[PDB]
Coordinates of C-alpha atoms and ligand atoms in Angstrom, one line a residue:
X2 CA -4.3 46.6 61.0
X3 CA -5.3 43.8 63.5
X4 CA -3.2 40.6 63.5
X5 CA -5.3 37.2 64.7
X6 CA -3.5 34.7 66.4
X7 CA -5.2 32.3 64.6
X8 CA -6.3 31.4 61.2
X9 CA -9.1 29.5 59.8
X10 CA -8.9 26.2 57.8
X11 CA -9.6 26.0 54.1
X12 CA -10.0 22.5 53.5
X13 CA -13.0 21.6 50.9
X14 CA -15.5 19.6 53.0
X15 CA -18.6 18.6 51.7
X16 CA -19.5 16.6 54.9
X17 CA -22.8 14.4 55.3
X18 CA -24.8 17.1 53.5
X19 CA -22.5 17.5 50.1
X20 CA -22.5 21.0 50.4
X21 CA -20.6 22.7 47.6
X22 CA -20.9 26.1 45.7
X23 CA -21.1 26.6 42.2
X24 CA -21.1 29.9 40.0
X25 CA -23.5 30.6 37.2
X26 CA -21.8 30.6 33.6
X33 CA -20.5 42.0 33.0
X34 CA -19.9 43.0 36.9
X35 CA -18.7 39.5 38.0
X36 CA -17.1 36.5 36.8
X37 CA -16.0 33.3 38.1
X38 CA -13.1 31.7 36.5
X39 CA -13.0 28.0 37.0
X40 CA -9.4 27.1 36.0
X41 CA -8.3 29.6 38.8
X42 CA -11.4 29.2 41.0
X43 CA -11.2 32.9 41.2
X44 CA -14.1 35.0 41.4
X45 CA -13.8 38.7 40.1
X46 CA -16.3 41.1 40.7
X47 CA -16.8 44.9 40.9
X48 CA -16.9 47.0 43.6
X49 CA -19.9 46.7 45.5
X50 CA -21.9 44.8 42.8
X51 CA -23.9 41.6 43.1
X52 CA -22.0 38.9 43.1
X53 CA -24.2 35.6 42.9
X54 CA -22.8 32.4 44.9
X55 CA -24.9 28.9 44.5
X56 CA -25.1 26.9 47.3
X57 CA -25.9 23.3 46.8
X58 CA -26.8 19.9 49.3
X59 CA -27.8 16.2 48.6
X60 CA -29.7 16.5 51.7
X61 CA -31.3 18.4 53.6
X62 CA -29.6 19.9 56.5
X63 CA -31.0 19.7 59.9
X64 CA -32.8 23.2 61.2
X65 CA -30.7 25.9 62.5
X66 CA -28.2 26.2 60.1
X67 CA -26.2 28.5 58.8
X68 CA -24.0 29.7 56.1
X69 CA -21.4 31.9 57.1
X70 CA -18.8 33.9 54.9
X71 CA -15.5 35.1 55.7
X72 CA -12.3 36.6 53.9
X73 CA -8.2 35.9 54.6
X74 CA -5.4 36.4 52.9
X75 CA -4.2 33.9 50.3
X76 CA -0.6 34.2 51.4
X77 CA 1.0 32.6 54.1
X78 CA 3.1 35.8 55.6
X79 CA -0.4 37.3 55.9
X80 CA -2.9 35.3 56.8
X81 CA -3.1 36.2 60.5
X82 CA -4.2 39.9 58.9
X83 CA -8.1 40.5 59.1
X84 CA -9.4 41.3 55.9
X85 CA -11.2 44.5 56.5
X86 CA -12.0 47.4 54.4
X87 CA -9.6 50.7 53.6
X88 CA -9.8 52.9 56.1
X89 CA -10.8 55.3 53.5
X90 CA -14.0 53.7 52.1
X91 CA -15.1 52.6 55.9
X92 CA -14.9 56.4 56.8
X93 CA -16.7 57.4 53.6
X94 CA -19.9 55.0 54.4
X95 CA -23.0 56.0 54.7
X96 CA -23.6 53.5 57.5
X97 CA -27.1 53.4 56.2
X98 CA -27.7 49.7 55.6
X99 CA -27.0 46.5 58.0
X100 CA -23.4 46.1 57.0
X101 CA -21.1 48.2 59.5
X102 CA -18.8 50.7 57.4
X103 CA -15.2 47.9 58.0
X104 CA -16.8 44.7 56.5
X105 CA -15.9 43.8 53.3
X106 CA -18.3 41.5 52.4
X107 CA -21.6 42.0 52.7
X108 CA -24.9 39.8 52.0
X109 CA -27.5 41.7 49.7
X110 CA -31.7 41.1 49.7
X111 CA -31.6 39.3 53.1
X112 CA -33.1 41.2 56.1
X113 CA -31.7 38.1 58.1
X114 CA -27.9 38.3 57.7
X115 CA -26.4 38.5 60.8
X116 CA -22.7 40.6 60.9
X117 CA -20.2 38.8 63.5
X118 CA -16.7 40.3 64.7
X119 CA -15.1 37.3 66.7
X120 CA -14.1 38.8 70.0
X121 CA -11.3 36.4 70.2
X122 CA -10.1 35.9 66.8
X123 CA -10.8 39.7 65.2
X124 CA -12.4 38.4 62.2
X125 CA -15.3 40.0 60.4
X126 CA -17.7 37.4 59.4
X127 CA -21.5 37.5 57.5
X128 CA -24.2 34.7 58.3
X129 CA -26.8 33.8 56.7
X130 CA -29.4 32.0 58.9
X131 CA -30.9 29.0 57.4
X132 CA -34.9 28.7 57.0
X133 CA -36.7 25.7 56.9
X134 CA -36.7 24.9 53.0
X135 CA -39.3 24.5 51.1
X136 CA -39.3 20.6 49.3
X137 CA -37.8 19.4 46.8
X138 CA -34.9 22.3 47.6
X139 CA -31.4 21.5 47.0
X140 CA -29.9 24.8 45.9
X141 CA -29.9 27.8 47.0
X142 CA -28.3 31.6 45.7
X143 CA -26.4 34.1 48.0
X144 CA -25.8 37.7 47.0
X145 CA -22.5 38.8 48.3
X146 CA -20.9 42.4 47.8
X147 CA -17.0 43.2 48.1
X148 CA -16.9 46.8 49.7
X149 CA -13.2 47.6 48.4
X150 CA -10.8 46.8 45.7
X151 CA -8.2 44.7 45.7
X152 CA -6.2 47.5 45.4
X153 CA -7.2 49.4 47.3
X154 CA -3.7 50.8 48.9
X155 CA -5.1 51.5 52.8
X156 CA -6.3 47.7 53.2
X157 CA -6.1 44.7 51.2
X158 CA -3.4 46.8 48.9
X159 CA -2.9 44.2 46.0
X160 CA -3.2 41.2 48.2
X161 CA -4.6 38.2 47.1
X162 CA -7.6 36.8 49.2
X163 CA -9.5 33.5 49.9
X164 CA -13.6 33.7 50.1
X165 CA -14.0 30.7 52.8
X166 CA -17.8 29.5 53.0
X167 CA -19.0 27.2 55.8
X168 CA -22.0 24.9 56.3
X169 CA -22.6 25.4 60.2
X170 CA -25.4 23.6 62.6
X171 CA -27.1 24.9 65.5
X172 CA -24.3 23.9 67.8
X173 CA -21.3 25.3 65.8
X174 CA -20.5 22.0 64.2
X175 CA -18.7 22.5 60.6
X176 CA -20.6 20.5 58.2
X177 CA -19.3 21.9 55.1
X178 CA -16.6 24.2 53.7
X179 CA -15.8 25.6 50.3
X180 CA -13.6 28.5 49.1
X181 CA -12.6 30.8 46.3
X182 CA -10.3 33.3 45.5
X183 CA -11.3 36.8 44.7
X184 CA -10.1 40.0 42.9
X185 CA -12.1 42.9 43.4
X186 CA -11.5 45.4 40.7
X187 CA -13.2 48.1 38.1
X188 CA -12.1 45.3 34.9
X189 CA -13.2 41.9 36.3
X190 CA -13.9 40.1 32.7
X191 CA -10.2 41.7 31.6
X192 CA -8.7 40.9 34.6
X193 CA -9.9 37.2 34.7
X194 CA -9.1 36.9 30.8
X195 CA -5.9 38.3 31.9
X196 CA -5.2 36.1 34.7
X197 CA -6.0 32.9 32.5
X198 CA -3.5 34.2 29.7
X199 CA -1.4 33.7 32.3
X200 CA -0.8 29.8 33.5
Ligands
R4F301 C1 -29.6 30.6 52.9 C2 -29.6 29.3 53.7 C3 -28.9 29.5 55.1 C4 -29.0 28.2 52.9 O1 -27.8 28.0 52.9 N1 -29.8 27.4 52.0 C5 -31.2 27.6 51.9 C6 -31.7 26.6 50.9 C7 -33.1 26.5 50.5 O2 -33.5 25.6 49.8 C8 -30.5 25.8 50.5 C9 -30.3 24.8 49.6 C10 -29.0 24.2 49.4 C11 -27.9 24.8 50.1 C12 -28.1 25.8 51.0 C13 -29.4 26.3 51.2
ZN302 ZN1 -11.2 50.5 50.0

């Protein structure tokens, strides 16, 4: 219900470091035509980060959701008030993000206190050598659909490649549809263009 007065850029940047994510070739599936992801509720969804070089220590990787559509993009993407009511609080996520990072006692959960976004980062350990790719497990915490929040909205996944001093040094995106039919929905969706 909260309106930003500001939203963030999605330009694909793969910066010094040629950051970039890819998706592995069911409970998720990524559907390169549309770069769509769709994915279950709350299932492991596996992102693949990749670099030419290593970035510098302190990094991070951060993950946040807006609307695809112009005439709501200033709307933070949260979850239903429904499903954050119902959680069990039980985990590090709170109850109104909807995406989470899964199997990482690291990730951090952010609310911008000036632009009301939810965000989840993922801090950046030294690598060991040789390492140029990486895999994030993200979870989506409420359907598309779901008629209290995102309500059959389309939304953007934006990924950024941060440094220790808040300096973007990479950015890529995907759309997402979280529903109970992802492999009929994206087969669906494909039919379509
Ligand atoms: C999870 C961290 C912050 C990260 O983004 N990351 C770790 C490693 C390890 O080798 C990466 C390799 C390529 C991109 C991102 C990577
Ligand atoms: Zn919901």
């Amino acid at each position: 219900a909260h309106m930003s007065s500001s939203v963030p850029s999605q330009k694909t940047y793969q910066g010094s470091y040629g950051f970039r994510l890819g998706f592995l070739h069911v409970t998720s599936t990524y559907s390169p035509a549309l770069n769509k992801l769709f994915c279950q509720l709350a299932k492991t969804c596996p992102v693949q980060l990749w670099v030419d070089s290593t970035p510098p220590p302190g990094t991070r990787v951060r993950a946040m959701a807006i609307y695809k559509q112009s005439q709501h993009m200033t709307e933070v993407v949260r979850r239903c008030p429904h499903h954050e009511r119902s959680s069990d609080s039980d985990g590090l996520a709170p109850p109104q993000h909807l995406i989470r990072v899964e199997g990482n006692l690291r990730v951090e959960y952010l609310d911008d206190r000036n632009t009301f976004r939810h965000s989840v980062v993922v801090p950046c350990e030294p690598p060991e050598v040789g390492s140029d790719s990486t895999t994030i497990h993200y979870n989506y915490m409420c359907y598309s659909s779901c008629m209290g929040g995102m309500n059959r909205r389309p939304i953007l996944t934006i990924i950024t490649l941060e440094d220790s001093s808040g300096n973007l040094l990479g950015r890529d995106s995907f759309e997402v549809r979280v529903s109970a039919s992802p492999g009929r929905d994206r087969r669906t969706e494909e039919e379509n263009l």
